[PDB]
Amino acid sequence: WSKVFQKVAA
Amino acid sequence: WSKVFQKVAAE
Amino acid sequence: QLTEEQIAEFKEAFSLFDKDGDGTITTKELGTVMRSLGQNPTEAELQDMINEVDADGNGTIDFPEFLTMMARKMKDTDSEEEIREAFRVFDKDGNGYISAAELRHVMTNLGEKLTDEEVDEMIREADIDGDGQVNYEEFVQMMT
Ligand SMILES: [Ca+2]
Ligand SMILES: [Ca+2]
Ligand SMILES: [Ca+2]
Ligand SMILES: [Ca+2]
């Protein structure tokens, strides 16, 4: 999930 | 440290 | 506080999980996405990733639950960033440790005229590895 957030933040 | 905490919270 | 666009792109991401556009992510759709990426998680690992985010208890992730979790992660990222920026400012010479001299200059800038004895006492309270300086992990501990 934190993978998904860090993709969308970048 | 208190005041450092207060100050960083304030930003 | 997510902006409108932040929300808009979190909706885009969500859409890539919600294959059939019904507004929920089931365990099976999560696993379809992960197998896309060359992964192969078990059903129990899939169910746990759903349960991490399912505020309802109802078996699925709706867009509001997803966004809720992404906002928490945004707010956590943004806290750390502010703490890390604070540390860098305190660490005047940028060697990654706050000295007593550096702490005293900063404390005055918050309108606290401190002597060395008081400043050194701050060092002592913060110094978990005994090296006489505040490292980034010691600062973060004091700011929690
Ligand atoms: Ca769906
Ligand atoms: Ca749900
Ligand atoms: Ca320094
Ligand atoms: Ca130390």
Report CA-CA distances (Å) from C107 to A5, C63, C104, C128: 36, 45, 5, 21
Q: Indicate yes or no: CB of B8 within 8 angstroms of CB of C126.
A: no
C116 marked as binding residue: no
Q: Are C124 and C142 in contact (CB under 8 A)?
A: no
Separation in Å, CA of C128 to nearest CA in chain A: 30
For C138, nearest residue in chain B (alpha carbons): B1
C127 marked as binding residue: yes
Measure the CA–CA gap between C135 and C133, rounded to whole angstroms: 6
Q: Among candidates C6, C16, C63, which has minimal Cα distance to A8?
A: C6
Query: Under CATH, to which class is C4-75 assigned?
Result: mainly alpha
Report yes or no on chains B and A touching (3+ CB pairs under 8 A).
no
Measure the CA–CA gap between C102 and C93, rounded to whole angstroms: 8
Pick left, alpha or beta for residue C51 (phi over 0 → left; psi -120 to 50 → alpha; otherwise beta).
alpha
Indicate which technique resolved this structure: X-ray
Helix, strand, or coil (residue C135): strand
Q: Are C120 and C126 in contact (CB under 8 A)?
A: no
Q: Are C59 and C50 in contact (CB under 8 A)?
A: yes
Measure the CA–CA gap between C86 and C41, rounded to whole angstroms: 40
Chain C residues with CB inside 8 Å of B11's CB? 82, 86
- DSSP per residue, C109-129: HTT----HHHHHHHHHHH-SS
Which secondary structure element, helix H or strand E, spans residue C56, and what is its range? none
Q: Which of B4, B7, B11 to mutate to test the interface with C (most CBs of C within 10 A)?
A: B4
The first and second tokens of residue C111, run together, are 């309108």
Measure the CA–CA gap between C18 and C11, rounded to whole angstroms: 10
Q: If you search the block for the tokens 């007593």, which residue do you land on?
A: C100
Q: Where are the beta strands (DSSP E) in chain C?
A: 24-25, 61-62, 97-98, 134-135
Chain C residues with CB inside 8 Å of B5's CB? 142-143
Q: Indicate yes or no: CB of C143 within 8 angstroms of CB of B4.
A: yes
In units of Å, what resolution does this entry have?
2.2
- CB atoms < 10 A from the CB of C16, how many? 12
- CB atoms < 10 A from the CB of C51, how many? 12
* CA B8 to chain CA centroid, nearest Å: 4
Measure the CA–CA gap between B11 and C135, rounded to whole angstroms: 21
d(CA C10, ligand 2 centre) in Å: 17
